[PDB]
Design a protein around this nucleic acid. Structure first.
Ligand SMILES: C[NH+](C)c1cc(NC(=O)CNC(C)(C)C)c(O)c2c1C[C@H]1C[C@H]3[C@H]([NH+](C)C)C(O)=C(C(N)=O)C(=O)[C@@]3(O)C(O)=C1C2=O
Ligand SMILES: [Mg+2]
Ligand SMILES: [Mg+2]
Ligand SMILES: [Mg+2]
Ligand SMILES: [Mg+2]
Ligand SMILES: [Mg+2]
Ligand SMILES: [Mg+2]
Ligand SMILES: [Mg+2]
Lengths: 67, 101, 37, 122, 304, 132, 584, 105, 192
RNA sequence: GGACCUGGCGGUGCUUCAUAUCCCUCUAGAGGAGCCUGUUCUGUAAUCGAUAAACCCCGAUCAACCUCACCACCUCUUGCUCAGCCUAUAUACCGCCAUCUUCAGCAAACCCUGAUGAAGGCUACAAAGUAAGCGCAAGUACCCACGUAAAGACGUUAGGUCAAGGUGUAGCCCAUGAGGUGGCAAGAAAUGGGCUACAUUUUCUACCCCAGAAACGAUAGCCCUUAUGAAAUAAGGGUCGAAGGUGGAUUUAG
């Protein structure tokens, strides 16, 4: 049921452990709490991969820097 | 070459909602998280209220896949009542019998 | 999408590889309707 | 008959259980006799089981405009038959699976296979 | 007919091919061999057994075509031809003649079976007259030729027996004798194990009957078979029970208990308690709601 | 009265086959199913597009095999081999038959992206089960 | 490949070929309409992705004048478009790189300044099956000329070669190969001399092309061309390029063109192959087989090397290397048919059954020739039980037999005196479509009415002959309006009388009178016997009148027999006397 | 839509309303007229598309055949008059039907 | 038409050679006058040569016992045998402790994408892990919602990552880090 | 006008029956109160279809926008479409049903009777009827052969739907077609069907039937919070403590 579909050799840490793309702010902040929430959500996504996970993360980074 | 203008309007809804799904997802998460300040949510309220009123999944009507009929559709084949009756009565649909229990 | 479907059947019929009686009906009926109307 | 015994020890499948779902008990038990005889001449251990059938019943109107009091009711018979394999090899497993999925029946067949590879902890 | 002949030849070659086809190159391939073979090769799955595949000989497949009743001169063969019911009227004449010369000297067939034997369509009153004439032949004291005539016309009865199936006594556990029976009533199942002695002790689902059955009606339901058979404080039952409600469970326990006390009681008494109505499953189960109704048989409002 | 798939008795002169003759309440008691695909059981996802491709296939084969299909096809579906098994008549020439078989073979393999196989079966005349 | 319906069966090899070409026609039907309309099919549903189910785009998507567009239309095989925009690059002044100028001249040399043919080439094998026994030399002269592109002077390839600045080995090799392919042999040799002057290296393909060009040159002796081939291989060794199987197979094809004088050179070539260590292929053996087999050779030691070849070649499994392995099997059992050797035919068939040599059989025409001559040999010198076993094993599973094969079946069955098998093979021939074969009809009828038979064989022959006559009647209005043969009519009549269908014999004697064909004396005597059985003086007088009208010299004996054997009235006596007076 | 197209017999039933015409077509004719080697012309093996003047000449032949077949629908049949036109009293039915007992009138 | 191979065909003929593949009915190829259908009142079941019901039957005319015998004469090459791991469940548990659920769901159509088919779940025995005392106390206190009492089976679920092999990786990673955090003594264990 | 034939009718006769229908009977309701939801009427700039049995929680297994075909305003012309139209006709239709049907008849092809009229065809101790085919029946599904399902032909009511879709006829194409934005679904009243009650076999609590206590009733109104949604209908809590005293004629269901 998984013929092809390598997902560039993601291998289980890029999908759920998003510290390396989290790029820690002051972790006591509500922004960092939102990052924890969205990180847990993107970890629990099985339908999305690491590339769209990190473009979601970067979209939030861009919007938060805009504000 | 669609069944009717209502079906074509619905497929416009589907295609461009599927395009404009991600931004709405980010900003309605920004609605219903209770961490951010209220005005910092109000600017987000402005952005979704400006996001067009054809991509929100509130206009998506599951019509019949062969012939446009809003009410009376079985989801498992996207078929209307009498079209599903027609096909599963002529017998081109596997496993559907007449329920006699 | 219905466009690939309907326009492919359209192209195949006017290539002559497809014969659909509904379009035959509309052709004959519109021929008579332009004859008299 | 290319073989190519390559490098690494067996994946050690215990209980590869095949749930065969069908609309048709005749297809299910003919396939049962097929799989049982194939497993018997293979030498692997086969056991039979019959999970109970599920009937998906639902109701539609009969006329197009009025007359709700006269409805039609349609049903689906989803019968399940279980062929559990215990004590079969990984190579025997995927060759037996390959054979039975070549000769899997049509739309009246699904082959839900449950594989328990054992391994060592780490 | 040549159609029948070439069909018979085709069936012979086909059954030879069928046995060689499956595994059975030896010449003896029986009809039930043929049926199981075609059942495996073509998965039937149609609710009508006549809509299933069939591989029989053309005698059974094709109906009985009556032979030509006249040769190439006109002149039909049987002398009672122009009646149009030649076999039936010949049978009347023959039975009448045996009655006549018997008087000078001194279950039953169904209409469908008689029509099959005569290969002629018959009327109901015609069949009644035939049965009446054969009754007259039996009532008159007749000889052995007439007896074998009547016995060729008469068929079997296939009587059943209503003696209740006695379960074997299982001398097991440590040294005790028990019987393990089953009961079902209204989606409830009860497997009961009664030991012959024990002075009366009930173990429904690990607890006693005063705990699992706080209702005196349920206690009377468990009472009922002991009190009919006058063996009240003599036995002990342990029950496992699944599903249903309080009275369905009580009735299922009563049924399984009675169907093991059958093994623990004499044959005259078990016939008597079947007559009392303790060994028969109650088929009264819930019906189905219907589309356009308000229940199983209850309908909606104003209809007339 | 019920007339879902019941052909009505005209005068006793109407050729009809088993499938058109039998009523929809004999759909699994006497008839069977004309398309065998796995979408309609307990656990499956894509049955809707299975059905839409089924009706596409029926109308397409009828439009491209004009006036030679005796009764309706058998649309079997196993793995990724589609089977269109046909009861086609013996009127048009076998060169035309093979031409349309290859044409349909290739286009349907190409439109549904799998192995698609058409298996013809030639019949002299449209078969009559009973005269109604 | 064919279907399983009895109406859709091919009956003959021509019908099978027509069915197959119609199927390939429909295949490229869908290919054409699909590549014309790729938009309707861009939606992929299968996973994983199938690029050979994805559309092939034949239009150039790159429109600006660029080297990427040059590589694009070179890959798309658009010769005129590539030439025109290479010109456009030249007037634009963009320096076009060496590799893509090479690729452009590669396309030009491969296609001869023309587009690729829109039809996938399956033609030029449409010879009729009624001329397979005469004039193979003129057949060679009118069938060895494929209408390819002759190398025209001042073409686009030569223009690009003159225009491009820095000539190299790849371009020189390409244009020598292209000149050889388009029959500019002398120009290719001159360009090779220019290569040697310019100090470049020519590769294996170019050297094989040069060998072919030297051989295809006109007005030179085989000795001179052999010395030239030796000089070219010495140049190969001096340029340190290693020759191979295709090189020596081109050499073997050339000496096959060079006939009787090149047999010992062919042996030297194969010995040098085994000395160097490159495995000779089936097509190597094909070239030496067809060299040593020539009509008019009275020695056949050139046919004993075939036993040498198989003595090398038993028990081996092969892989595809060289296109003439199907021709190897066809030619080697062409030797078998020429030599009439059952043991070698069986040994080649065993080599065939070893492994994928059944794949090495090749095309349908070669397969039909293969099994046709094999079964001709089987019927010629095998015993009848194993000929019938090979008949049921090969026909029609392997091939569709021919009418010459049919008459050879009849000859074999007549030699074996197993005339009870004639109706079965007759029904098989009518099944395969030999109904309108008059030679087959004449052969079956003469072998069929030659002798007196047991009555069940007689009535089976009566049914077969009645159906033959039904076909003869049911051939209406064709340009080959074959008149009723006298021998066929006489044999049909004799069979009808022997089976006892006298009335149909009489009405086809009416057909004798209708078609003005002279009847046979044995037939007239059998008619005398049938008239004796039926006691019919009128029928006897009718057939005696037929004999008198055809003026046969047995009519006096027929009249004397009728007088001796029938009680005849005076007016019939007078009529018979008048007929005898007219014949006298 | 192609999906909501229907069948010839059903459309004739719906149009005629009797319960209360494609025979003049070859298998491969289209308005583009890309004549195949399997369809129309027999099986040289060369795919081609015929020219314009051939397209309109072929369809003009088809439409004059249409008009001729409309005419062969619309002849007038000649019925002999029995005692008057539109009557039945002198109309000659044919010979009596041949008897199944080897009898003919 | 032609007289068919049904009556051209004679006894002792190889049937794996006749029908290699799963194919629809083809009555001319079938040497059997098989009759379908509910018969008419004064008639017989409908004949063989044209039955769409014969066609619609899933047609297990490509598989008989002697064919499957010969098929697995060919297919007998593709197998090893087992060691003496024994039929004893406790013996095979001792030899190989952990147990893992990793499945496939075979559909039939254009695509083989059943996402739920990546479900993976690991069951391991503490009595086979053999190295847990206050570590097993800490273990249970970590995984409260699993570890039913009546059998010593630990069942950890993964359906969070799209691929089956990295689901297996999540199972083994969770096992080893739950083990390591159980053996990591924390400073607030005593104030329980 | 006279005499008939066939059918329908009869507050038409005799006889035998109906059994949840015909009555006497048996149980539980409606009709009386509140609420929900359709319909009529009124209203609005604001769809349409059903309308005794066989309409009235009906198309809808379902309208905040969407749905939507309604209205208001403003825009589009080869308009997603070799356009389209939810424009008119269910009295042109196919398609999909209701009703008799909680029936058993409809009948090709013949033969006979009636001076060869419409028409009719019955007597088993038998006087002209024989009958292919549909239907009942039979065979299937569910737990049995019981029961419930399914099934019930020809025809009836021009019975329902051009609005599920297709479609003939007539019409439009500056329109009656297409798109965008915003509103339409309120009761001086009435009526159909449901839900909850008017409590003592009741109410609250634990238990899920061996107690303690009382000695009533909105799923309505208002407020708060939550769910889902761009934008509240639904859910919970708070608040409140209606009318209501087991309902006549008539009627429903078993
Ligand atoms: C006026 N009448 C003579 C009539 C006429 C037509 N149609 C036409 O004549 C129109 N014809 C044109 C369009 C001009 C070509 C009609 O179409 C109708 C009717 C009658 C109705 C009566 C309907 C009524 N319903 C609404 C309750 C009724 O009492 C019944 C019934 N059985 O209950 C009906 O029969 C009725 O529904 C009905 O069918 C009518 C018409 O169809
Ligand atoms: Mg009904
Ligand atoms: Mg007139
Ligand atoms: Mg409008
Ligand atoms: Mg009406
Ligand atoms: Mg109306
Ligand atoms: Mg019903
Ligand atoms: Mg019935």
């Amino acid at each position: 049921n998984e013929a092809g579909f390598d997902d560039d050799g993601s291998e289980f840490h890029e999908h759920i452990f998003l510290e390396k793309h989290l790029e820690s702010f002051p972790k006591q902040g509500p922004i960092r709490h939102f990052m924890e929430l969205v990180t847990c959500g993107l970890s629990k996504n099985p339908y999305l991969s690491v590339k769209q996970k990190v473009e979601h993360i970067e979209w939030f980074r861009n919007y938060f820097n805009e504000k | 070459h669609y069944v009717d203008w209502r079906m074509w309007r619905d497929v416009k809804r589907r295609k461009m909602a599927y395009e404009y799904a991600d931004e709405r997802l980010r900003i309605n998460s920004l609605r219903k998280n209770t961490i951010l300040p209220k005005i910092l949510q109000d600017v987000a309220d402005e952005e979704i209220a400006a996001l067009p009123r054809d991509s929100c999944p509130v206009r998506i009507r599951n019509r019949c896949v062969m012939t446009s009929r809003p009410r009376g559709v079985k989801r498992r084949w996207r078929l209307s009542r009498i079209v599903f009756r027609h096909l599963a009565d002529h017998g081109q649909l596997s496993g559907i019998q007449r329920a006699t229990w | 999408n219905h466009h690939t479907y309907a326009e492919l059947m359209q192209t195949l019929r006017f290539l002559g590889l497809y014969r659909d009686e509904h379009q035959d009906f509309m052709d004959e009926q519109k021929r008579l309707k332009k004859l008299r109307g | 008959p290319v073989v190519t015994i390559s490098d690494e020890p067996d994946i050690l499948y215990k209980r590869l259980s095949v749930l065969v779902k069908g609309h048709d008990k005749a297809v299910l038990d003919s396939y049962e006799y097929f799989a049982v005889l194939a497993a018997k001449e293979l030498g692997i251990s086969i056991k039979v089981h019959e999970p109970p059938r599920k009937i998906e019943r639902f109701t539609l109107l009969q006329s197009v405009h009025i007359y709700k009091k006269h409805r039609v009711q349609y049903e689906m018979r989803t019968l399940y038959r279980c062929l559990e394999l215990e004590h079969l090899t990984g190579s025997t497993a995927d060759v037996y699976l390959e054979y039975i999925q070549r000769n899997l029946p049509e739309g009246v067949a699904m082959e839900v296979t449950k594989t328990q590879l054992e391994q060592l902890p780490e | 007919e040549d159609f029948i002949k070439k069909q018979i030849e085709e069936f012979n070659i086909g059954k030879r091919h069928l046995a060689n086809m499956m595994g059975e190159d030896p010449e003896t391939f029986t009809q039930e061999d043929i049926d199981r073979a075609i059942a495996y090769l073509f998965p039937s799955g149609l609710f009508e057994k006549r809509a299933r595949p069939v591989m029989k000989h053309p005698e059974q497949i094709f109906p009985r075509q009556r032979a030509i009743q006249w040769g190439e001169d006109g002149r039909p063969f049987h002398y009672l031809f122009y009646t149009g019911k030649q076999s039936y009227y010949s049978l009347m004449h023959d039975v009448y003649g045996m009655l006549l010369n018997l008087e000078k000297h001194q279950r039953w067939l169904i209409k469908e079976e008689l029509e099959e034997m005569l290969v002629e369509k018959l009327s109901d009153l015609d069949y009644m007259q035939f049965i009446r004439l054969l009754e007259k032949l039996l009532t008159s004291q007749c000889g052995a030729a007439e007896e074998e005539f009547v016995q060729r016309f008469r068929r079997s009865v296939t009587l059943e027996s209503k003696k209740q199936l006695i379960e074997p006594v299982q001398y097991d556990e440590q040294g005790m004798a028990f019987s393990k029976s089953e009961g079902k009533r209204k989606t409830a199942k009860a497997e009961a194990i009664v030991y012959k002695h024990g002075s009366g002790r009930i173990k429904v689902n690990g607890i006693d009957y005063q705990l699992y059955f706080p209702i005196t009606q349920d206690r009377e339901q468990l009472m009922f078979p002991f009190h009919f058979v006058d063996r009240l404080g003599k036995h002990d039952v342990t029950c496992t029970v699944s599903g249903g409600g309080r009275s369905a469970q009580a009735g299922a326990i009563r049924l399984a208990m009675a169907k093991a006390l059958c093994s623990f009681v004499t044959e005259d008494e078990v016939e008597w308690m079947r007559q009392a109505g303790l060994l028969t499953t109650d088929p009264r189960v819930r019906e189905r709601k219907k589309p356009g109704q308000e229940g199983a048989r209850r309908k909606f409002t104003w209809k007339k | 009265k019920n007339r879902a798939a019941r052909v009505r008795v005209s005068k006793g002169d109407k050729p009809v086959t088993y499938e058109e003759a039998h009523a929809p309440h004999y759909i699994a008691h006497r008839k069977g199913w004309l398309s065998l695909h796995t979408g309609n059981l307990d656990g499956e996802d894509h049955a809707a597009e299975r059905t839409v491709e089924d009706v596409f296939l029926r109308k397409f084969m009828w439009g491209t095999f004009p006036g030679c299909l005796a009764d309706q096809l058998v649309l079997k579906r196993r793995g990724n081999q589609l089977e269109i098994c046909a009861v086609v008549l013996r009127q048009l020439s076998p060169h035309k038959y093979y031409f349309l078989v290859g044409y349909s073979e290739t286009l349907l393999s190409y439109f549904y992206k799998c192995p698609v196989r058409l298996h013809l079966q030639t019949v002299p005349s449209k078969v009559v089960y009973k005269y109604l | 490949v064919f279907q399983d319906d009895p109406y859709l069966m091919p009956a003959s090899s021509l019908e099978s070929r027509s069915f197959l070409l119609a199927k390939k026609s429909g295949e490229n039907v869908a290919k054409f309409i699909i590549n014309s309309y790729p938009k309707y099919f861009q939606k992929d549903i299968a996973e994983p992705h199938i690029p050979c189910l994805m559309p092939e785009y034949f239009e150039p998507q790159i429109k600006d004048i660029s080297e990427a567009a040059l590589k694009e239309r070179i890959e798309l095989r658009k010769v005129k478009a590539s030439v025109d925009m290479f010109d456009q690059l030249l007037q634009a002044g963009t320096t076009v790189s060496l590799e893509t100028t090479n690729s452009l001249l590669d396309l030009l040399c491969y296609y001869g300044d023309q587009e690729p043919s829109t039809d996938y080439h399956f033609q030029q094998t449409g010879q009729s099956e009624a001329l397979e026994e005469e004039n193979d030399e003129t057949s060679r002269r009118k069938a060895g000329h494929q209408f390819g592109v002759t190398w025209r002077a001042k073409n686009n390839a030569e223009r690009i070669f003159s225009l491009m600045p820095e000539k190299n080995e790849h371009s020189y090799c390409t244009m020598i190969r292209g000149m050889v392919k388009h029959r500019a042999y002398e120009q290719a040799l001159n360009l090779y001399t220019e290569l040697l002057n310019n100090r470049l290296h020519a590769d294996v393909y170019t050297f094989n092309a040069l060998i072919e060009a030297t051989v295809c040159a006109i007005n030179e002796k085989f000795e001179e061309k052999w010395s030239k081939i030796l000089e070219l291989l010495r140049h190969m060794v001096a340029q340190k390029v290693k020759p191979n199987l295709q090189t020596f197979n081109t050499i073997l094809k050339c000496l096959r063109r060079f006939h009787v004088f090149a047999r010992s050179p062919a042996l030297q070539v194969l010995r040098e192959m085994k000395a160097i260590g490159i495995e000779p292929s089936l097509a190597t053996y094909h070239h030496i087989i067809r060299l040593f087999d020539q009509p008019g050779d009275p020695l056949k030691r050139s046919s004993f090397i075939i036993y040498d070849i198989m003595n090398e070649l038993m028990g081996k499994r092969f892989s595809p290397k060289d296109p003439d392995d199907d021709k190897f099997f066809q030619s080697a059992m062409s030797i078998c048919s020429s030599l009439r050797d059952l043991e070698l035919a069986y040994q080649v068939h065993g080599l065939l059954k070893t492994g994928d040599n059944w794949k090495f059989i090749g095309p349908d025409q070669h397969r039909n020739f293969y099994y046709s001559k094999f079964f001709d040999l089987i019927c010629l010198m095998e015993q009848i039980d194993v000929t019938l076993k090979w008949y049921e094993d090969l026909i029609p599973s392997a091939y569709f037999p021919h009418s010459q094969t049919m008459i050879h079946l009849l000859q074999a069955l007549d030699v074996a005196n197993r005339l009870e098998v004639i109706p079965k093979i007759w029904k098989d021939s009518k099944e395969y479509g030999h109904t309108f074969r008059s030679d087959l009809r004449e052969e079956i009828l003469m072998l069929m009415a030659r002798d007196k038979h047991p009555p069940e064989l007689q009535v089976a022959f009566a049914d077969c002959a009645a159906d033959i006559k039904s076909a003869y009647e049911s051939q209406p209005i064709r340009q080959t309006a074959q008149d009723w043969p006298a021998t066929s009519l006489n044999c049909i009549a004799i069979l009808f009388l022997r089976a006892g269908r006298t009335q149909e014999a009489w009405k086809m004697l009416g057909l004798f009178r209708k078609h003005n064909k002279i009847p046979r004396s044995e037939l007239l005597n059998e008619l005398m016997d049938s008239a004796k059985v039926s006691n019919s003086p009128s029928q006897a007088i009718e057939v005696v009148e037929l004999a008198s009208a055809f003026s046969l010299p047995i009519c006096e004996g027929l009249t004397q027999r009728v007088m001796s054997d029938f009680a005849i009235n005076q007016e019939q006596k007078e009529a018979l006397s008048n007929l005898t007076a007219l014949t006298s | 839509s192609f999906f909501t197209k229907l069948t010839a017999d059903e459309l004739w039933k719906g149009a005629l309303a009797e319960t209360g015409l494609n025979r003049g077509q070859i298998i491969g004719e289209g308005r583009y007229g890309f004549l195949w080697p399997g369809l129309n012309v027999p099986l040289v093996q060369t795919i081609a598309q015929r020219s314009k003047e051939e397209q309109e000449k072929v369809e003009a032949d088809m439409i004059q055949q249409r008009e001729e077949w409309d005419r062969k629908k619309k002849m007038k049949v000649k019925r002999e008059r029995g005692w008057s036109g539109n009557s039945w009293g002198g109309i000659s039915l044919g010979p009596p039907d041949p008897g199944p007992c080897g009898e003919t009138y | 038409a032609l007289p068919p191979r049904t009556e051209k065909m004679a006894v002792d003929q190889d049937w794996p050679s006749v029908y290699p593949v799963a194919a629809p009915f083809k009555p001319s190829a079938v040497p059997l006058p098989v009759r379908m259908g509910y018969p008419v009142k004064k008639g017989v079941p409908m004949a063989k040569e044209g039955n769409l019901e014969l066609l619609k039957i899933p047609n297990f005319l490509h598989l008989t016992p002697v064919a499957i015998k010969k098929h697995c004469e060919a297919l007998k090459d593709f197998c090893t045998e087992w060691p003496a791991a024994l039929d004893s469940d406790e013996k095979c548990e001792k030899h190989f402790p952990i147990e893992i659920d990793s499945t496939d769901y075979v559909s039939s159509g254009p695509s083989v994408r059943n996402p739920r088919a990546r479900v993976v779940v690991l069951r391991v025995k503490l009595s086979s892990l053999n190295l847990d005392d206050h570590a097993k106390k800490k273990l249970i206190k970590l995984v409260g919602e699993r570890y039913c009492k009546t059998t010593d089976v630990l069942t950890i679920k993964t359906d969070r990552c799209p691929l089956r092999r990295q689901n297996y990786d999540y199972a083994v990673y969770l096992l080893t880090v739950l083990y390591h955090e159980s053996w990591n003594t924390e400073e607030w264990e005593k104030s329980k």
